Amino acid sequence: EVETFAFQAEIAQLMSLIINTFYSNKEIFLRELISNSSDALDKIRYESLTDPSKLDSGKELHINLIPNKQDRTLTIVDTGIGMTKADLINNLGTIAKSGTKAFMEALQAGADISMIGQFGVGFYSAYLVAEKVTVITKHNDDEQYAWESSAGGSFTVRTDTGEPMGRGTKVILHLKEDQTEYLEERRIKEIVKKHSQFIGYPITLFVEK
Ligand SMILES: O=C(c1ccc(O)cc1)N1CCOCC1
Numbered sequence: 001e002v003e004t005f006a007f008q009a010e011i012a013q014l015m016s017l018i019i020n021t022f023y024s025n026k027e028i029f030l031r032e033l034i035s036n037s038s039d040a041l042d043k044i045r046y047e048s049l050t051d052p053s054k055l056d057s058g059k060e061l062h063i064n065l066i067p068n069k070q071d072r073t074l075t076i077v078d079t080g081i082g083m084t085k086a087d088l089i090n091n092l093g094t095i096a097k098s099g100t101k102a103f104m105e106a107l108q109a110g111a112d113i114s115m116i117g118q119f120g121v122g123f124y125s126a127y128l129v130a131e132k133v134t135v136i137t138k139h140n141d142d143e144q145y146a147w148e149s150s151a152g153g154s155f156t157v158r159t160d161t162g163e164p165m166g167r168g169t170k171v172i173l174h175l176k177e178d179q180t181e182y183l184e185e186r187r188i189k190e191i192v193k194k195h196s197q198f199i200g201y202p203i204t205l206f207v208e209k
């Protein structure tokens with residue numbers, strides 16, 4: 001049971017702009033994804049302060065970065081609050097329509113693609129490096145879903161029967177052939193140190209055999 005959905009026109013436009021604009025500073029995608037993860041983790045931590053049972057789906061609050069050169073994927077896993085199916089369909093928890101309007105106006109006026117996170121649509125910077133993005137997520141109030149999109153104006157949602165996550169969000173970046181630098185340990189470490197120094201959760205970079 002796979003459901004296919006059209007992006008809102010303004011979100012298809014943002015994705016196209018991201019894909020088609022010449023812009024060399026692509027490494028900011030990782031900062032934006034880690035930032036989203038940090039915000040998701042903040043959310044569950046806040047809930048947990050008045051209801052400890054909120055962490056029954058897992059107490060550890062962290063971010064893992066998992067490169068796989070065989071599959072040409074980079075995976076960003078967090079144990080944050082996760083997303084319900086509704087929030088996944090509603091632009092992965094963002095106010096993407098108004099965010100994209102503001103970002104576009106900022107760009108027309110001299111901002112650049114690196115400032116995307118100030119407009120609350122940083123998720124979509126994944127498409128600077130990924131030909132396809134898969135998002136697996138689990139929220140305490142819903143089941144585990146997989147969202148997926150190779151852009152082109154549509155995404156799919158299905159119940160995920162894969163490995164259960166407990167709680168949180170996993171973003172799997174199926175990288176463009178020319179973007180495999182972001183599987184290399186030294187490159188990922190450099191990006192993290194440069195851009196994510198003040199993220200208040202452990203970020204563990206996995207190594208490959
Ligand atoms: O799970 C996520 C999430 C995590 C990481 C991403 O890259 C995108 C969404 N979110 C739900 C809580 O509100 C923030 C978004």
Ligand SMILES: [Mg+2]
Pocket residue numbers: 039
């Ligand atoms: Mg913020």
